[PDB]
Amino acid sequence: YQVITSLLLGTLIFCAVLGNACVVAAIALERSLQNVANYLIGSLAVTDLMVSVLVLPMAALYQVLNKWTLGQVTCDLFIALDVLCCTSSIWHLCAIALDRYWAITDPIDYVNKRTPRRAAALISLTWLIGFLISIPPMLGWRTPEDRSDPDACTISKDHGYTIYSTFGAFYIPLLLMLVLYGRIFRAARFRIRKKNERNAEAKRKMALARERKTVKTLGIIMGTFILCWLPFFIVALVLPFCESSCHMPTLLGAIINWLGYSNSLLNPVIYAYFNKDFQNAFKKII
Amino acid sequence: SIAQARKLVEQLKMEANIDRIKVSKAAADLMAYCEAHAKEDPLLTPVPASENPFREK
Amino acid sequence: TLSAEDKAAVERSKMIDRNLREDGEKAAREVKLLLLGAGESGKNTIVKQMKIIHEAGTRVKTTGIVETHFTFKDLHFKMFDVGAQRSERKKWIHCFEGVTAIIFCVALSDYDLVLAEDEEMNRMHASMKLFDSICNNKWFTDTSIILFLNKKDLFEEKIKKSPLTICYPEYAGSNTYEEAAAYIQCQFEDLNKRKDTKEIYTHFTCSTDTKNVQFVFDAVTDVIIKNNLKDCGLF
Amino acid sequence: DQLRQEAEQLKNQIRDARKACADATLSQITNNIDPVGRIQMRTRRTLRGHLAKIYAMHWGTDSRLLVSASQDGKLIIWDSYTTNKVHAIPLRSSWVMTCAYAPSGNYVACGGLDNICSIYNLKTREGNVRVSRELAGHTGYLSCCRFLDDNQIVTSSGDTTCALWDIETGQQTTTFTGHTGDVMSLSLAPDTRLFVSGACDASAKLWDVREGMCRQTFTGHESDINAICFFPNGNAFATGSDDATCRLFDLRADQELMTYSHDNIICGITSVSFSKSGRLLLAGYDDFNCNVWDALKADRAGVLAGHDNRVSCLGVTDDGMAVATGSWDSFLKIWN
Numbered sequence A: 001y002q003v004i005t006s007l008l009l010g011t012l013i014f015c016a017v018l019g020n021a022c023v024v025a026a027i028a029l030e031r032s033l034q035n036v037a038n039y040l041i042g043s044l045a046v047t048d049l050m051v052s053v054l055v056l057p058m059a060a061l062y063q064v065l066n067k068w069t070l071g072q073v074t075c076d077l078f079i080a081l082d083v084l085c086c087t088s089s090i091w092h093l094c095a096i097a098l099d100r101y102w103a104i105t106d107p108i109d110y111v112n113k114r115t116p117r118r119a120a121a122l123i124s125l126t127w128l129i130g131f132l133i134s135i136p137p138m139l140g141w142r143t144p145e146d147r148s149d150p151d152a153c154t155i156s157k158d159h160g161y162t163i164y165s166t167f168g169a170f171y172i173p174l175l176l177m178l179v180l181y182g183r184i185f186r187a188a189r190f191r192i193r194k195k196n197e198r199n200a201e202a203k204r205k206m207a208l209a210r211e212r213k214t215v216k217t218l219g220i221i222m223g224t225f226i227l228c229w230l231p232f233f234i235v236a237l238v239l240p241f242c243e244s245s246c247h248m249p250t251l252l253g254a255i256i257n258w259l260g261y262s263n264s265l266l267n268p269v270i271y272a273y274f275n276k277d278f279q280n281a282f283k284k285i286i
Numbered sequence B: 001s002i003a004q005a006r007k008l009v010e011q012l013k014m015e016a017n018i019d020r021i022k023v024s025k026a027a028a029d030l031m032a033y034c035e036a037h038a039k040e041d042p043l044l045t046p047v048p049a050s051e052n053p054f055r056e057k
Numbered sequence C: 001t002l003s004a005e006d007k008a009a010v011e012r013s014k015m016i017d018r019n020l021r022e023d024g025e026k027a028a029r030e031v032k033l034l035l036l037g038a039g040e041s042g043k044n045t046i047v048k049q050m051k052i053i054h055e056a057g058t059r060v061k062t063t064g065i066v067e068t069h070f071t072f073k074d075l076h077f078k079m080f081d082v083g084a085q086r087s088e089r090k091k092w093i094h095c096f097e098g099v100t101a102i103i104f105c106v107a108l109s110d111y112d113l114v115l116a117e118d119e120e121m122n123r124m125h126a127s128m129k130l131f132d133s134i135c136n137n138k139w140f141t142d143t144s145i146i147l148f149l150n151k152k153d154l155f156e157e158k159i160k161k162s163p164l165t166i167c168y169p170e171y172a173g174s175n176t177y178e179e180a181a182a183y184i185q186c187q188f189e190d191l192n193k194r195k196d197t198k199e200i201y202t203h204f205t206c207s208t209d210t211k212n213v214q215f216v217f218d219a220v221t222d223v224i225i226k227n228n229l230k231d232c233g234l235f
Numbered sequence D: 001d002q003l004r005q006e007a008e009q010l011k012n013q014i015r016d017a018r019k020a021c022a023d024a025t026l027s028q029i030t031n032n033i034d035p036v037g038r039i040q041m042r043t044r045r046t047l048r049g050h051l052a053k054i055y056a057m058h059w060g061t062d063s064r065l066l067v068s069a070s071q072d073g074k075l076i077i078w079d080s081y082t083t084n085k086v087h088a089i090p091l092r093s094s095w096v097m098t099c100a101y102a103p104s105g106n107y108v109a110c111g112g113l114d115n116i117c118s119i120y121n122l123k124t125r126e127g128n129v130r131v132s133r134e135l136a137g138h139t140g141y142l143s144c145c146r147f148l149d150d151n152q153i154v155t156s157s158g159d160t161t162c163a164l165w166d167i168e169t170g171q172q173t174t175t176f177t178g179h180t181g182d183v184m185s186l187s188l189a190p191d192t193r194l195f196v197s198g199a200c201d202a203s204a205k206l207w208d209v210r211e212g213m214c215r216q217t218f219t220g221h222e223s224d225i226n227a228i229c230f231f232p233n234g235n236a237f238a239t240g241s242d243d244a245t246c247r248l249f250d251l252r253a254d255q256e257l258m259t260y261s262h263d264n265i266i267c268g269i270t271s272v273s274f275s276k277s278g279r280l281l282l283a284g285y286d287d288f289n290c291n292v293w294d295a296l297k298a299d300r301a302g303v304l305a306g307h308d309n310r311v312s313c314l315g316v317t318d319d320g321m322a323v324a325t326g327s328w329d330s331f332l333k334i335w336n
C-alpha cells in the first residue's frame, strides 16, 4: 500500500525537479531567454526547484511513513524551509504578475527604467517576504502543543501566526495577483478592441480570437494558482480557529497539501513550457 | 546610351585580348601549391596542442 | 597568468566590457524607427515636423543614412532616413531587422504625378509597390508600420481639379477628400499580408506642431504594449 | 546602336576562348588526390561583448589581434589568444557592414550604410583610438574595404564602383567602374598588385590597382556575389553567392575551375576564405553554419556549427592556425 504512494510521490518529485532544472538551465545557457521577465520566470523555477529538492522529498518521507522520524530541530528547520520556499514561490507568481502589469500599462517604464536590476529587486523582495513569514515560528509564536507530540511535524497553529502566515503568504498575494491581472485584462481588452466587409470580418475574428486567448491565458494562470494553493490556505486558516467539531480526514488533508505542492510542478509548465521562446530554446538544446 | 557602348566594347576586346593558359595547367599549378604548402597548413593537419596557441600556451 | 602585462590587459578588457554594457543599456532605451518612402513623398516634411523644438535628444557629411534623434513624452526615438541610399534594398534592409516600427511616408498628391523614369508609371503605384515590398519582407514579419499620408491639402486640391480614376481605374465613387483619402488608405492597408503579426497605423499628416509626433508616439507605445501582451500570451 | 552586335560577338569569342582552354576540369585533375577527410574543428575561443548583429571581422597580420564590426556602433579589437578586448571604438554611425585591419596594425577601417570609410589610428601617443580619417565620395553603402598598405585603402560600395583611396591625401586615387550591381565583396591579392571584387550582377572582376582598369571578368554565378577571396597563390579566387554556391575561378585560365555546392544547402554564402595552403575553402552560410570544403575536390570536409544566427563574416589567420567566424548572434568564434 505504501509502495504505490511512495512511487507516486517520487514520480511527482522527479517531474517537478526535472521541469524546474530544465527551465533554469535553458535560461542559463541561452542568451535569448535573458530578459527581466525570463529572469523572474527563472527565479520562480529556482524557487520551485528548491521546493522540489529540499521540501518535496521530506514531505514524501513524512507522508509515506505517516510519522516524522527525524527529530524536533530538523522538523522545525524543515517547516521553516517549507514555509520560506512556498511563500517565495507564491510571491514569485506575484512578482511576475507585477512585472507584466508594468510592461502592459507602462511602456515608457518598460523602455526606459526597466532593467535586470528590477528583476533582482523583485526576487529579493519575494525572498524577503518568504523569510519574514518563515522566521517568526523559530523565534516565537509557538505553542507547547507542537512539541506535545514528538511523532509529528505540524506547523504552528497559533491564531496570530495563522493569520500572519496565511494572509501574508497567500491571501494578500491572491488579492494582489487578482487586482494586477484584472487590470492587465482590462488593458488587453482595450488594446484588442481598438472588400471592406471582408476586412472588417477578419478584424472582428482576430479580435475575438485575441479575447479568447487572453481569457484562456489569465484563466490558466489564476486557476492553476487557485486550484493549487487556495484549498490549502483555506484549510490552514479555518482549522487553527476550529479546535473542535471540525475533524479533517487524513486523506483529504494530504491531497490538499500535495495540491499545494503541485504548484511547484505546474509553474514551469504555466510560465516556461507554454511560451514560444522557451519551446524554441528547448528544441535548439535538444 | 551610345557613349557607354564604346567603353563596353573596348573593355570586352581588352578582356578578350589577354593571354589564357589551359585549364589543365591551372589545375596542376593549383594542386602543386596545395600539396607544397599542405605541411604548413594548421587547419588541414590538426597541429599538436603543445604549440597550438588557442588551446595551450 | 600572474604577469603584470596580463593583469593590465584583463583589467583593460573588463573596463572596456563595462563601457560596452553601459552603451548597450543606453542604446536599449531608444526606439528605433525606419523611415521609408519615395523621393518627393513628404519624408522631409515629417523629419522637419518632428525636429521642431526637440532635436538630438570637422565631421564629413555622410549622405548615406540620416539619423534623427528626438525625445517625446520621455521616450527617445531614433529615425533612420535611408531615402538617399540609392542601391539594392535587399542588401541592407536586414540591417534594420529589429526596429520598433517602420514610418512609411507616401505623398497623397502624387497619384496624378508619374515618375520621371517613364510616363506610364504612377508615383502612387511606385509607393504602393515599395510599401508592399517592405511590409512583407522576411525581416519585417512582426514589425508594425506607421503609415503617413502626406500632402492632404494638395491632394484635396488635385482631386477637386483632377479625378482619382487615373490612379485607380477600378475606383468608382464621388470625388471628395474623405472618400478618396479613405480609399487610398484602404488600398495601402490591404497590402498587409501579415495581418495577424503586424498592424498598420495610418495618419494623415497635418500642419499641427505636435500631432504627427503624437501619432508616432501613440503607435510606438501601442506596439510596445502589444508586444508585451504577446510575450505574456494575451495577444 | 550597332555596337551591341559586335559586343555580343566579342562575348561569344571570349566564351570560345574559354572553351578552347577547358580541356580537363579540376575535378578530373584532382581525381587521384587523396581526400582531405573529415575536418574536426572545435570552437577554441568565444569572443563575447557585441550587443548587436556582427557584420564584419578581419584578422591581423600577427594572427593574434582581430577586429569585429557590429551594429551596436562598435569596432572591437579582440586579442583572440586571451579573449581580451584591446579596444572598443565607438562608431559615429552604428550601421557598419565592413571592417579592415591594417597590415601594419597601426590603423583599422570601417564603413557601412554611411557612405564613409572611417580609418582609426589604433597606435597613437596617448593610447586612445581616434578617427584618423573619414574617406567620402562613395554614393552607396560601403560593403567592403581592405587596406592596400599603411597609406592606401581599397574600398567597394553599393553604387556599383570600387575606389582606391590615399588616406593621407583623403581623396580617391583611382576609381574602378564597370560593375552593373552593388559590389558586395572585395579581396586583395597577396602581391598587393591586383584585387578581385564581387558584385550584385552575379559577376566578379579582377582589377589592377595601379592601372585602375578591369583586367578580367568572371561571369559564372546565377545570383549576386556576397563573398570573394583570393587563393593563397594569388592566381585563383573563390566567390560565394546567394545561388547557394561557391565558385573557384582561375586568373590565368580566365574561367571557373570548380563549383562547391550541395543539394542540402539552399541558403546564400556571406563569407568565404581559404586556409594557408588553400586546400580548405571555408564558407559561412545563412543556414547558421559554416562549411569547410576541399578546394581541390568540392567535397564538404567539415561543418563549423555553433552560431545561433547567420554567419556574416569569416576569416583565416595569416599563419592559418585558426579560423574566426562572426555571426548575427553577436559572438565571434575562434575555431582552429
Ligand SMILES: C/C=C\C/C=C\C/C=C/C/C=C/CCCC(=O)O[C@H](COC(=O)CCCCCCCCCCCCC)COP(=O)(O)O[C@H]1[C@H](O)[C@@H](O)[C@H](OP(=O)(O)O)[C@@H](O)[C@H]1O
Pocket: A015, A016, A018, A019, A022, A216, A217, A220, A269, A270, A271, A272, A273, A274, A275, A276, C230, C231, C232, C233, C234
Ligand atoms: C468546452 C470548450 C472549450 C474548452 C475546451 C478546450 C480548450 C481548453 C482547455 C483548458 C486548457 C488547458 C490547458 C491548455 C494548455 C495549452 O493549450 O497549451 C498550449 C499547448 O502546448 C502544449 O500542448 C505543449 C505543452 C508542453 C508542456 C510540458 C509537458 C511536460 C511537463 C512536465 C515537466 C517535466 C518534464 C519536462 C501552449 O500554450 P497556450 O495555447 O495555452 O497559449 C498561451 C498560454 O496560455 C500562455 O501561458 C503562454 O504565455 P506564458 O505565460 O509566457 O507561458 C502563451 O505564450 C501561449 O502559449
Ligand SMILES: CC(C)CCC[C@@H](C)[C@H]1CC[C@H]2[C@@H]3CC=C4C[C@@H](OC(=O)CCC(=O)O)CC[C@]4(C)[C@H]3CC[C@]12C
Pocket: A211, A212, A213, A215, A216, A217, A219, A220, A221, A222, A223, A224, A227, A228, A259, A262
Ligand atoms: C489538478 C489541479 C491542480 C487542478 C487544475 C485545474 C486546471 C486544470 C483548471 C482550473 C481553471 C481552469 C481554466 C478556467 C477557465 C479557462 C478559460 C477558458 O477560456 C476559453 O478559451 C473559453 C472561451 C471564451 O472564454 O470565450 C479556457 C479554459 C480555461 C483556461 C481553464 C483551463 C483549465 C484550468 C486552468
Ligand SMILES: CC(C)CCC[C@@H](C)[C@H]1CC[C@H]2[C@@H]3CC=C4C[C@@H](OC(=O)CCC(=O)O)CC[C@]4(C)[C@H]3CC[C@]12C
Pocket: A004, A005, A008, A009, A012, A063, A250, A251, A254, A255, A258, A259, A262, A265, A266
Ligand atoms: C497537478 C497535476 C499534475 C496533478 C497532481 C496530482 C497530485 C496532486 C496527486 C498525485 C498522486 C497523489 C498522492 C497519491 C497517494 C497518496 C497517499 C494517500 O494516503 C492516505 O490515504 C493516507 C491516509 C490513510 O489512509 O490513513 C494520501 C494522499 C496521497 C499522498 C496523494 C496526494 C495527491 C497526489 C500527490
Ligand SMILES: O=C1CC2(CCCC2)CC(=O)N1CCCCN1CCN(c2ncccn2)CC1
Pocket: A054, A055, A056, A058, A059, A060, A062, A063, A075, A078, A079, A082, A083, A084, A086, A087, A133, A153, A154, A155, A165, A166, A169, A236, A257, A260
Ligand atoms: O509534509 C510535511 C513535512 C514538512 C517537513 C519536511 C517538508 C515539510 C512539514 C509539514 O508540515 N508537512 C506537511 C505539509 C503542511 C503544509 N506545508 C505547505 C507550506 N505551508 C505554508 N506555506 C506558506 C505559508 C504558510 N504555510 C506550510 C507547510
